[PDB]
Design a protein around this ligand. Structure first.
Ligand SMILES: CCCCCCCCCCCCCCCCCC(=O)OC[C@H](COP(=O)([O-])OCC[N+](C)(C)C)OC(=O)CCCCCCCCCCCCCCCCC
Ligand SMILES: CCCCCCCCCCCCCCCCCC(=O)OC[C@H](COP(=O)([O-])OCC[N+](C)(C)C)OC(=O)CCCCCCCCCCCCCCCCC
Ligand SMILES: CCCCCCCCCCCCCCCCCC(=O)OC[C@H](COP(=O)([O-])OCC[N+](C)(C)C)OC(=O)CCCCCCCCCCCCCCCCC
Ligand SMILES: CCCCCCCCCCCCCCCCCCCC(=O)O[C@H](COC(=O)CCCCCCCCCCCCCC)COP(=O)(O)OCCN
Ligand SMILES: CCCCCCCCCCCCCCCCCCCC(=O)O[C@H](COC(=O)CCCCCCCCCCCCCC)COP(=O)(O)OCCN
Ligand SMILES: CCCCCCCCCCCCCCCCCCCC(=O)O[C@H](COC(=O)CCCCCCCCCCCCCC)COP(=O)(O)OCCN
Ligand SMILES: CCCCCCCCCCCCCCCCCCCC(=O)O[C@H](COC(=O)CCCCCCCCCCCCCC)COP(=O)(O)OCCN
Ligand SMILES: CC(C)CCC[C@@H](C)[C@H]1CC[C@H]2[C@@H]3CC=C4C[C@@H](O)CC[C@]4(C)[C@H]3CC[C@]12C
Ligand SMILES: CC(C)CCC[C@@H](C)[C@H]1CC[C@H]2[C@@H]3CC=C4C[C@@H](O)CC[C@]4(C)[C@H]3CC[C@]12C
Ligand SMILES: CC(C)CCC[C@@H](C)[C@H]1CC[C@H]2[C@@H]3CC=C4C[C@@H](O)CC[C@]4(C)[C@H]3CC[C@]12C
Ligand SMILES: CC(C)CCC[C@@H](C)[C@H]1CC[C@H]2[C@@H]3CC=C4C[C@@H](O)CC[C@]4(C)[C@H]3CC[C@]12C
Ligand SMILES: CC(C)CCC[C@@H](C)[C@H]1CC[C@H]2[C@@H]3CC=C4C[C@@H](O)CC[C@]4(C)[C@H]3CC[C@]12C
Ligand SMILES: CC(C)CCC[C@@H](C)[C@H]1CC[C@H]2[C@@H]3CC=C4C[C@@H](O)CC[C@]4(C)[C@H]3CC[C@]12C
Ligand SMILES: CC(C)CCC[C@@H](C)[C@H]1CC[C@H]2[C@@H]3CC=C4C[C@@H](O)CC[C@]4(C)[C@H]3CC[C@]12C
Ligand SMILES: CC(C)CCC[C@@H](C)[C@H]1CC[C@H]2[C@@H]3CC=C4C[C@@H](O)CC[C@]4(C)[C@H]3CC[C@]12C
Ligand SMILES: CC(C)CCC[C@@H](C)[C@H]1CC[C@H]2[C@@H]3CC=C4C[C@@H](O)CC[C@]4(C)[C@H]3CC[C@]12C
Lengths: 43, 350, 150, 203, 150, 150, 150, 150
């Protein structure tokens, strides 16, 4: 009988967690490479 | 559309207003006539004090010289641009940096020319354009080593991106300084055009025409000036920027060009350039091709002010004030040399 | 009787008619005004003529208002679902047609005003194009009326 | 455009989910579960009415602030060399603020139409109460969004007029007309809102 | 014996037919508009000649209007779900075909009016291309009619 | 007997066959017209020969139209839900295959007309590529017919 | 017995097999066409020899067409939900494998034709790489056919 | 029970095992081909050796194909939901591991092929890295071969 409650809890909790993981992985993947002092030396 | 109206003024509205206020201070035609009617450089300063310039020249020595006036004008322009830059945010800051790259490209050429001829780099800074000052210390105390200077440029100068058009530091001693300068300017112009296009909106609309004309005039004048020189057509075509409106088959035809008549024929396909070439009689006593291109450049910069929410206003103001400083220096030269006849050759603005 | 929720779609029809038409008119007026103000420094004597696009943009708002008024006067708490859907369709039609016409009027008016600043002969041409954009909003109004009165 | 990428991803995912969900409901003969009537009816009219009032005020204030800063940045940038602007161009700001005023007024005109039911069964709540809630929500949306767009438009026109004023004093008097036109839209919204809640009666 | 919400889809046909088409037309009338302005500074004599794109864009709007009015006259309170779906399909077809045709007309007209300032011979070419773009909208109308008059 | 929502999928098939094919043809025509305008500045004599892309783009629209009309003729009150699925699949296939073919034709035609301004010998090659970029739409049409006439 | 909605997944499988494969082939053709247009200016006599990547993209489209027709000929009214899922999986497999193969073919062909303008020996290498991309689509087809005939 | 939709997940497993592996292999092949094109201009003799990355990318596809066929061969009308979930898991494992391995192989191959143009000694090093990257795909395969047969 509580299908609405658990469905919404799980759906939105997991959507929020997935969004947080995606945002963190994008902030790390698109992190500044950090060797800008070396980009112009290697290239 | 990009709707720059909604968010432009968040970071750049104050500077938009400020640069438009500065542009309001560019000498009008009436002020140019007033300055033209002067008899002596002292009278030129007197008539100039009533304009926006004010007392920029009162401190200097009473026996004025054209060099002093030019230096003061350049200093005022540099101060205004630096003040605008210091108050600008990331996108507009990058735009103004791109504006300064144009002078950094000449300054680095001066540095390499001095280093190859074994003159102290520290002694070349005074002759560099202030707007392209190499405040970085990596390119100083180089000990007159071209390789060290090239490494310094690559490491601690925004020109590192444009120096990848070259292949090695040996090119500094291989290619003529003019070819190096023109290749750097081609790369810089292409980067500037790409940046402006990426900005999009009113910025791209009001700035791409100016860069396109810059590329086209670069192509035309590189073709015209290189006819009698050892600069081969294959090496000449490398100096044509690809931003212009001549890119499809226009730049190629210019590269194949072998005479001014052929350059005029190439320009004929474009009415806006056809008119400039037609008006450039080039015989003594009438406007030359460079003067016609200056008039068109001034026209484009002036039209850049009909848009509101864009960064092209800053580039337009910088170029318009550069032309105004050149006009004032020209008037001072005509006054000093008593050559009143050509005193009308200044290009009016507004 | 009819459903309890029937009036919802008519209410949304009126709201859309006004909101989207207001969006279109506001964009048209803003774009035209920011073109006109920038032109005026160069060609101060043209402002009045150059006000024509703004007026056209304003007319778009009026259309919305008109239809909105209709939907706000023919909408009772017990209207059939059919009439409520008709009013929703009329409102969406007028609102979004006015939005498109307002965008077109803003773009055309700004460009033509600047061109007239640079080329007086363009004035008449601009007007024609503006009319062709303005008519778009009118079209929506027509359809909206046909739907709202039915 | 990282945040733009996030918004676009959320929008695309939501609407792809909606398309697939609608296809599944329609095709599996489960349309009866997609009761839009149940949604519009069980949902309390108080939610709609209070969202309407909140939007009527908040979106009007958002438009007023948008226009105010859009035109104030230009005013205070131009006035560095022509301070007279600060004296003359406050009218632009006034117009922007006028938008917000309409907001509160309509909020009042909407908030005066609220009244509890003491009922929960949709038959008990009734057409009158449900239409009152829906119409208060719609009037709030109309006034809020019309005021938002009018305020933004007036701000853009005011920034243009302030930049024009910095270079020629005799232009503002002729550019204010545009602002007046840009202001009319606000009024229109208010009128429509007043027409939407003219015959609204909760209770 | 039909759902009272059947008319909804049919309405969303009419609305759509007049909305999307308008949007498409607007885009045309916008882009071409700008182009004309940009090319009017140097070649004023071509302003009236170079108004064909806008006209074509305008015609696209008319297409939508036609279908919209047709749908708005075929709506009834007891409209079956089948006829309602037919009208929704016709409205979407005409609206989005007109939207695509308006995009094509705007782009082609802008490019053609800008080029004709430099290459007079291009004019006829532009017209041909514009006709092709116009034809796209026409196709939609055809389908819409076939769907809206079954 | 049969579900009343089957006609929705049938009309969606028709309107997709029209709308997506029209969008593909519009993109092809727009890109090809931009390329033709750019090319004709220096090489006016190729304004007509360089119109083949546009034609090859228009053909794509025709494909969609065909399928659309077929669906709009196969629709009836009591189409089995399976028949509606067949029509929807045919419409989606033709529309989206035509959309991809129109993208390819636009890109290829723009590139080919720009190149042919500098190298005449490319023309023939361009044509071949366009054919290879057009059969794609044809393939979709085939599948659509196989689905629509089943 | 079988649910009335079973054929939905089958028609979607056929439509995917056609549409996604056509999209992949269209991307491949577009990229190869741009590459050939850039190449042909300096080295015209390589145009015919450089048409291979477009042919490989066409072959990917043909894979998609084959699977689509197979599904559209094994699709019956009383199609079991299990067989409908099989056909949907076959369609998705072939369509998206062909999409990936078309992307690879487009990028590889563009790079290879551009390079071969400067290094003739690269030609053979390009072909090899293209084949290694082509088999990708082939693999999809294999799986699709299995799922179609299971 | 064996719900009638039990085979859906197994079919999606096969579709994933093929589609994602194909996407990974396509990306690997595309990046490696770009690198080979940019390398062969200066070092033509290295075209055949520097094709090793493509082969590795191809191997990734093979992995997927295997699992896909395996899953395709393990399907059945009354496939128990547990086995369907197992096969979906195996398909996702192999497909996404192959996607990651293909991305890694593409990037590593591009970088190593470009570097080996300038430093021949890098060749062997690249191979080692490539092997590591490819092993990732193998891991996925292994997990798939544990799940699809569990
Ligand atoms: C990525 C950004 C973050 C996320 C932002 C967007 C969030 C979107 C919000 C999702 C909520 C959707 C409503 C869920 C309820 C409706 C479900 C439904 O139609 O099925 C149940 C309906 C009704 O079910 P029923 O009524 O028979 O069930 C009995 C009732 N219960 C279960 C409550 C006891 O139909 C079915 O039974 C279908 C069964 C199969 C499930 C199909 C679901 C559709 C979507 C599947 C794929 C996912 C789509 C996205 C694709 C990938 C991303 C682009
Ligand atoms: C390219 C994308 C990949 C394709 C798949 C996308 C993800 C979709 C999967 C979401 C998870 C849901 C899995 C099923 C869960 C169990 C549901 C259930 O119990 O079903 C009962 C539902 C509803 O109940 P019922 O109809 O079985 O019960 C009878 C009900 N009456 C009497 C009213 C008719 O029906 C089923 O049995 C459904 C079984 C298959 C469902 C498959 C998922 C639906 C969505 C598929 C994708 C739609 C787009 C297709 C085209 C895509 C092309 C790009
Ligand atoms: C992205 C922009 C928006 C457009 C796409 C999304 C639109 C819908 C998004 C909201 C969520 C889903 C809404 C639908 C809910 C289902 C309602 C329902 O079951 O009742 C149906 C109703 C009633 O179903 P019913 O089972 O009561 O049947 C009637 C039976 N009698 C008469 C006895 C009562 O009928 C319909 O089928 C109406 C059509 C709407 C439902 C289908 C939604 C379409 C979703 C988009 C995909 C279109 C397919 C083609 C793809 C190509 C498009 C060009
Ligand atoms: C790279 C490949 C790897 C994939 C990435 C990871 C993804 C893995 C899956 C994670 C997301 C979902 C995890 C589980 C969700 C279900 C949790 C509740 C379990 C459940 O079924 O509860 C039942 C009741 O549920 C209910 O009453 C309601 C259940 C409905 C829940 C629906 C949730 C929506 C989807 C959420 C995730 C969406 C985005 C995820 C990224 C049983 O309880 P009972 O007492 O009824 O027992 C039965 C007798 N009746
Ligand atoms: C596209 C592929 C498919 C995607 C489908 C999945 C759904 C979308 C998920 C995102 C997928 C793309 C990756 C984007 C990652 C997040 C955005 C970029 C990174 C980021 O968040 O960092 C900065 C914001 O700070 C932050 O971290 C703030 C963000 C968190 C705010 C959370 C509140 C919003 C909740 C959602 C409800 C609102 C709905 C509105 C429509 C923005 O970076 P930058 O642009 O400044 O720098 C440039 C580079 N980052
Ligand atoms: C190609 C793209 C797709 C285009 C197709 C249109 C998609 C529109 C999306 C909305 C959903 C589709 C519309 C039809 C399905 C409506 C729900 C029918 C289910 C049903 O039987 O519910 C009835 C109530 O719903 C009703 O009677 C509700 C009537 C209203 C339905 C339409 C409302 C949609 C939302 C519109 C918002 C517009 C906003 C504008 C800004 C039953 O009720 P009963 O009386 O038998 O109860 C008996 C209780 N014992
Ligand atoms: C580009 C793609 C091309 C390749 C083809 C597509 C292949 C990938 C897509 C696979 C789609 C299938 C995913 C399966 C989800 C449903 C699994 C069954 C769930 C189930 O029956 O249990 C319910 C739990 O729901 C739940 O909570 C389950 C929801 C799980 C949410 C997590 C999302 C799925 C993870 C895998 C997707 C990875 C995609 C990577 C790109 C219980 O609910 P109840 O008690 O009401 O049951 C009443 C039923 N009698
Ligand atoms: C008034 C000016 C702006 C001219 C523009 C015409 C528009 C706004 C008006 C004027 C007369 C109107 C028509 C008058 C009568 C009817 C009959 C009614 O059953 C449906 C609406 C319909 C068909 C109207 C449609 C819209 C209409 C054509
Ligand atoms: C010039 C004015 C009228 C507007 C321009 C568009 C005109 C030509 C369009 C708009 C709506 C159209 C009408 C829409 C619907 C119908 C019903 C049909 O069974 C006969 C044609 C008829 C009556 C159309 C005739 C043409 C029409 C009047
Ligand atoms: C080139 C010309 C003919 C096309 C321009 C006008 C178009 C919109 C008209 C002309 C004749 C029209 C057809 C004439 C009669 C009918 C029968 C009707 O039950 C469905 C629509 C249908 C099939 C029409 C479709 C639209 C149509 C093709
Ligand atoms: C622009 C033109 C030349 C290209 C081809 C378009 C025309 C001729 C096409 C488009 C739609 C087609 C129709 C599609 C469906 C049907 C019903 C079918 O049972 C017999 C033929 C018939 C009636 C077709 C005849 C030809 C047709 C009218
Ligand atoms: C030959 C090449 C160029 C294809 C051009 C024609 C294509 C688009 C069309 C024209 C007539 C069509 C056929 C007409 C009728 C049938 C019978 C039907 O039960 C299945 C499909 C099938 C077999 C069609 C397949 C596609 C088809 C062959
Ligand atoms: C160049 C392009 C069009 C290639 C077309 C693909 C060909 C090879 C494929 C696509 C679908 C295939 C058909 C699918 C179904 C049948 C019916 C079957 O009982 C025997 C073979 C036959 C008749 C196949 C023959 C080959 C076929 C026509
Ligand atoms: C162009 C080619 C290489 C691609 C297709 C690959 C071939 C070899 C594969 C793909 C699918 C395969 C079929 C899949 C399923 C069955 C059913 C089985 O009871 C007999 C073998 C048979 C009929 C297979 C024969 C071989 C087959 C047709
Ligand atoms: C390397 C190239 C040729 C790709 C093909 C790989 C081969 C070795 C793989 C791919 C799929 C595999 C099949 C997958 C499933 C089964 C089911 C089992 O009951 C018998 C073995 C059998 C039939 C496998 C035999 C080997 C196989 C055909
Ligand atoms: C051959 C090279 C690449 C080394 C890879 C190791 C191979 C041979 C190993 C690693 C994991 C192994 C699988 C692990 C689990 C199972 C399921 C079991 O019920 C039977 C064998 C089977 C399917 C194995 C087959 C062989 C396998 C794939």
């Amino acid at each position: 009988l509580e299908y609405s409650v658990v469905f919404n809890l799980v759906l939105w909790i997991m959507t929020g967690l997935a969004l947080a993981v995606i945002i963190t992985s994008y902030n790390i993947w698109n992190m500044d490479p950090g060797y800008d002092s070396i980009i112009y030396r290697m290239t | 559309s990009f709707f720059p109206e909604l968010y432009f003024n968040v970071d750049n509205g104050y500077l938009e207003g400020l640069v438009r206020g500065l542009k309001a201070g560019v000498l009008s035609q009436a002020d140019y006539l007033n300055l033209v009617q002067c008899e002596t450089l002292e009278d030129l300063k007197l008539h100039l004090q009533s304009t926006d310039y004010g007392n920029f020249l009162a401190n200097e020595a009473s026996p004025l010289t054209v060099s002093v006036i030019d230096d003061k004008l350049k200093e005022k322009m540099v101060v205004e641009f630096r003040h605008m830059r210091n108050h600008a945010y990331e996108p507009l800051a990058s735009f103004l940096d791109f504006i300064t790259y144009s002078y950094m490209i000449d300054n680095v050429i001066l540095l390499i020319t001095g280093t190859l001829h074994q003159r102290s780099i520290a002694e070349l800074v005074p002759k560099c354009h202030p707007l392209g000052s190499f405040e970085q210390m990596e390119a100083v105390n180089i000990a007159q080593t071209p390789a060290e200077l090239y490494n310094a440029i690559l490491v601690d100068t925004p020109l590192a991106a444009f120096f990848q058009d070259c292949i090695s530091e040996q090119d500094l001693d291989e290619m003529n300084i003019e070819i190096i300068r023109n290749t750097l300017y081609k790369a810089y112009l292409e980067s500037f055009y790409k940046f402006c296009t990426l900005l999009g909106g009113t910025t791209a609309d009001a700035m791409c025409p100016i860069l396109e004309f810059e590329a086209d005039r670069r192509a035309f004048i590189i073709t015209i000036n290189s006819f009698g020189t050892e600069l081969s057509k294959e090496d000449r075509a490398k100096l044509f920027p690809h931003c212009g409106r001549l890119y499809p088959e226009g730049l190629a035809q210019l590269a194949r060009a072998d005479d001014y008549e052929q350059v005029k024929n190439v320009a004929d396909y474009y009415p806006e350039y056809k008119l400039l070439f037609e008006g450039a009689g080039s015989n003594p006593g009438d406007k030359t091709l460079e003067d016609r291109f200056f008039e068109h450049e001034v026209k484009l910069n002036k039209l850049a002010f009909l848009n509101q929410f864009h960064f092209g206003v800053f580039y337009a103001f910088v170029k318009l004030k550069e032309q105004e400083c050149r006009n004032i220096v020209w008037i001072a030269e005509c006054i000093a040399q008593r050559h009143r006849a050509k005193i009308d050759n200044y290009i009016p603005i507004f | 009787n009819n459903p309890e929720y029937s009036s919802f779609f008519g209410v949304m029809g009126a709201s859309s008619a006004m909101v989207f038409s207001a969006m279109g008119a506001a964009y048209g007026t803003a774009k035209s005004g920011t073109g006109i103000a920038a032109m005026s420094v160069m060609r101060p004597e043209l402002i009045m003529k150059s006000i024509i696009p703004v007026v056209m943009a304003g007319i778009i708002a009026i259309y919305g208002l008109v239809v909105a008024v209709l939907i706000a006067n023919s909408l009772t708490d017990g209207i059939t679902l059919y009439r409520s859907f008709l009013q929703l369709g009329a409102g969406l039609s007028v609102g979004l047609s006015g939005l498109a016409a307002g965008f077109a009027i803003g773009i055309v008016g700004d460009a033509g005003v600047r061109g007239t600043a640079q080329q007086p002969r363009l004035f008449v041409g601009m007007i024609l194009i503006l009319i062709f954009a303005e008519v778009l909003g009118l079209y929506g109004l027509i359809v909206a009326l046909i739907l709202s009165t039915k | 455009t990282g945040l733009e990428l996030l918004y676009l991803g959320i929008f695309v995912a939501f609407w792809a989910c909606m398309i697939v969900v609608g296809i599944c409901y329609t095709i599996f003969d489960l349309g009866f579960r997609f009761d839009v009537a149940w949604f519009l009816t069980e949902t309390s009219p108080f939610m709609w009415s209070n969202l309407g009032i909140g939007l009527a005020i908040s979106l009007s204030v958002v438009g007023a602030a948008w226009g105010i800063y859009i035109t104030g940045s230009s005013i205070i940038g131009g006035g560095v060399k022509a301070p007279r602007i600060k004296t003359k161009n406050l009218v632009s700001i006034i117009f922007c603020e006028a938008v917000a005023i309409y907001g509160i007024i309509m909020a009042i005109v909407i908030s005066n139409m609220a009244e509890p039911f003491s009922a929960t069964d949709p038959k008990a709540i009734g057409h009158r109460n449900y239409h009152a809630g829906y119409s208060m929500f719609g009037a709030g949306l109309t006034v809020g969004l019309s005021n938002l767009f009018c305020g933004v438009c007036v701000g853009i026109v005011g920034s243009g007029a302030a930049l024009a004023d910095a270079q020629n004093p005799s232009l503002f008097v002729k550019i204010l007309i545009v602002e007046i036109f840009g202001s009319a839209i606000g009024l229109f919204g208010v009128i429509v809102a007043i027409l939407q809640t003219s015959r609204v009666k909760m209770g």
